[PDB]
Enzyme design. Structure first.
Site, mmCIF file in Angstrom:
data_model
loop_
_atom_site.group_PDB
_atom_site.id
_atom_site.type_symbol
_atom_site.label_atom_id
_atom_site.label_comp_id
_atom_site.label_asym_id
_atom_site.label_seq_id
_atom_site.Cartn_x
_atom_site.Cartn_y
_atom_site.Cartn_z
ATOM 1 N N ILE A 43 0.825 -1.201 0.000
ATOM 2 C CA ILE A 43 0.000 0.000 0.000
ATOM 3 C C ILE A 43 0.863 1.258 0.000
ATOM 4 O O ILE A 43 1.699 1.448 0.884
ATOM 5 C CB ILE A 43 -0.941 0.037 1.220
ATOM 6 C CG1 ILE A 43 -0.134 -0.022 2.519
ATOM 7 C CG2 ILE A 43 -1.938 -1.111 1.154
ATOM 8 C CD1 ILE A 43 0.051 1.327 3.177
ATOM 9 N N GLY A 44 0.656 2.112 -0.997
ATOM 10 C CA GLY A 44 1.424 3.339 -1.093
ATOM 11 C C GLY A 44 2.098 3.496 -2.442
ATOM 12 O O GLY A 44 2.195 2.540 -3.211
ATOM 13 N N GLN A 45 2.565 4.708 -2.731
ATOM 14 C CA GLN A 45 3.234 4.987 -3.996
ATOM 15 C C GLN A 45 4.527 5.764 -3.767
ATOM 16 O O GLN A 45 4.528 6.808 -3.113
ATOM 17 C CB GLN A 45 2.308 5.778 -4.922
ATOM 18 C CG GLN A 45 0.952 5.126 -5.129
ATOM 19 C CD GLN A 45 -0.163 6.139 -5.301
ATOM 20 O OE1 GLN A 45 -1.258 5.972 -4.763
ATOM 21 N NE2 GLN A 45 0.110 7.196 -6.055
ATOM 22 N N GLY A 46 5.625 5.247 -4.309
ATOM 23 C CA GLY A 46 6.908 5.905 -4.152
ATOM 24 C C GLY A 46 8.031 5.161 -4.848
ATOM 25 O O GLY A 46 8.711 5.716 -5.710
ATOM 26 N N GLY A 49 10.962 2.868 -1.033
ATOM 27 C CA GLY A 49 10.383 3.074 0.281
ATOM 28 C C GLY A 49 8.871 2.958 0.274
ATOM 29 O O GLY A 49 8.165 3.954 0.429
ATOM 30 N N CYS A 50 8.374 1.739 0.092
ATOM 31 C CA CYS A 50 6.936 1.498 0.065
ATOM 32 C C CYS A 50 6.440 1.001 1.419
ATOM 33 O O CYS A 50 7.219 0.501 2.232
ATOM 34 C CB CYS A 50 6.590 0.477 -1.022
ATOM 35 S SG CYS A 50 4.936 0.678 -1.723
ATOM 36 N N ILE A 51 5.140 1.145 1.655
ATOM 37 C CA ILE A 51 4.539 0.711 2.911
ATOM 38 C C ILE A 51 3.770 -0.593 2.730
ATOM 39 O O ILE A 51 3.142 -0.817 1.696
ATOM 40 C CB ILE A 51 3.587 1.782 3.477
ATOM 41 C CG1 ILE A 51 4.254 3.158 3.447
ATOM 42 C CG2 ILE A 51 3.169 1.421 4.895
ATOM 43 C CD1 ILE A 51 3.982 3.934 2.177
ATOM 44 N N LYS A 71 7.220 -0.099 7.110
ATOM 45 C CA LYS A 71 7.843 0.670 6.041
ATOM 46 C C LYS A 71 9.289 0.227 5.845
ATOM 47 O O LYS A 71 10.088 0.248 6.784
ATOM 48 C CB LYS A 71 7.792 2.165 6.361
ATOM 49 C CG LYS A 71 7.827 3.052 5.127
ATOM 50 C CD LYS A 71 8.593 4.339 5.388
ATOM 51 C CE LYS A 71 7.986 5.512 4.634
ATOM 52 N NZ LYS A 71 8.539 5.632 3.258
ATOM 53 N N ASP A 177 10.741 19.909 14.218
ATOM 54 C CA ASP A 177 9.662 19.762 13.248
ATOM 55 C C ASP A 177 8.315 19.623 13.950
ATOM 56 O O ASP A 177 7.901 18.521 14.309
ATOM 57 C CB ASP A 177 9.916 18.546 12.353
ATOM 58 C CG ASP A 177 9.805 18.880 10.878
ATOM 59 O OD1 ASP A 177 8.831 19.561 10.496
ATOM 60 O OD2 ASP A 177 10.693 18.461 10.106
#
Length: 361
Positions: A43-46, A49-51, A71, A177
């Site tokens: 699940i995820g887009q990149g 480094g995907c989840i 991750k 941050d």
């Protein structure tokens, strides 16, 4: 656009084809803590480094509502090792629960740590950390609402962020941050705010030695001009005022909507100029930003404390705390909105904490 705009990978830096891999759906690895975690579908887009969906070793397969998520990222990476190290060290089940007890509060908006697992292959070492799920980022809703926030909403966070700041502030760990980009709300609890993905959490009090006002641009320099603490802008060492500055800036960003140096980010000299200029005469910022027929004393005093803070002077949470309640009481209004940011909108997460990205020795 993909066709219009061309994506550049790199002219000269990496060589050969790395090529990564993944894990089978329905498998359960053994974290370092001897904990069994089942991994479902991706699940995820990149890219690298995907989840991946994660869940406690219960039974059956994994659906689309897994409790925890993992991750995967490079092992040689730096910021990553910090986010995972800060979680297993700061985001501990005891450290978190213990606080609530020693704080006489309900729950802690700090993310909980689960575990992690590494694996080497032909010299290539991988590492992944297990974290819980979330709802949506505060930065998303902000842009979705045309960058418009309410007085009760902003002030609501200022109170939650304070308590969270003290937690890390007492552990010799600077936030750095605190923006909304690193905030999220619980899926089940929409009124619950969580501050994840530090990407700037460092300690400036090693061996009881508090960092003195000294020149150290090499350290604590990682940050975007959008809210880079004056400490780095000048090349000084990490200070306490730097933290309040980050929250102070964004605080006025959402309250007003736009900052004076919003259309001049390209000019680093200008940003630093208006900073010092606005510091001496804070009443000018509220006057230019806010109309003469509306001057929130909550903001005026807020900065008056920040600019009137000494390197040796300790934090005044109590005092400032009185200014907040006074702001609402002044406008005949009370906390009747809470974290009004429930909508949901996920699509990938991050993992960092360090603060020194430039050359990377």
């Amino acid at each position: 656009m993909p066709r219009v705009k061309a994506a550049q990978a790199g002219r000269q830096s990496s060589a050969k084809r790395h090529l990564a891999e993944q894990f089978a759906v329905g498998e359960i690895i053994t974290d370092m803590a001897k904990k069994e975690w089942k991994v479902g579908l991706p699940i995820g887009q990149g890219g690298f480094g995907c989840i991946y969906l994660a869940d406690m070793n219960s039974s059956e397969s994994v659906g689309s509502d897994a409790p925890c998520v993992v991750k995967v990222e490079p092992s040689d990476n730096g910021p990553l090792f910090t986010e995972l190290k800060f979680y297993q060290r700061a985001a501990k089940p005891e450290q978190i629960q213990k606080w609530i007890r020693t704080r006489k509060l309900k729950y802690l908006g700090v993310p909980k740590y689960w575990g992690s697992g590494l694996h080497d292959k032909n010299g290539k070492s991988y590492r992944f950390m297990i974290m819980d799920r979330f709802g949506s980022d505060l930065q998303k809703i902000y842009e979705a609402n045309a960058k418009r926030f309410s007085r009760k909403t902003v002030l609501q966070l200022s109170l939650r962020i304070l308590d969270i700041l003290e937690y890390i502030h007492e552990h010799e760990y600077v936030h750095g941050d605190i923006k909304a980009s690193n905030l999220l709300l619980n899926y089940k609890n929409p009124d619950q705010v969580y501050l994840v993905d530090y990407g700037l959490a460092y300690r400036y009090c090693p061996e009881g030695v508090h960092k003195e006002y000294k020149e150290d641009p090499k350290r604590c320099h990682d940050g975007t001009i959008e809210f880079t603490s004056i400490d780095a802008h000048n090349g000084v060492a990490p200070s306490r005022r730097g933290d309040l500055e980050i929250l102070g800036y964004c605080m006025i960003q959402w309250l007003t909507g736009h900052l004076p140096w919003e259309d001049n980010l390209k000019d680093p000299k200008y940003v630093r100029d208006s900073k010092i200029r606005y510091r001496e005469n804070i009443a000018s910022l509220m006057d230019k930003c806010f109309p003469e027929k509306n001057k929130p004393g909550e903001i005026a005093k807020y900065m008056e404390t920040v600019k009137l803070l000494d390197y040796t002077e300790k934090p005044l949470y109590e005092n400032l705390r009185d200014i907040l309640l006074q702001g609402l009481k002044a406008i005949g209004s009370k906390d009747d909105g809470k974290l009004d940011l429930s909508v949901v909108e996920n699509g990938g997460l991050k993992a960092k904490t360090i603060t020194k990205k430039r050359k990377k020795e």
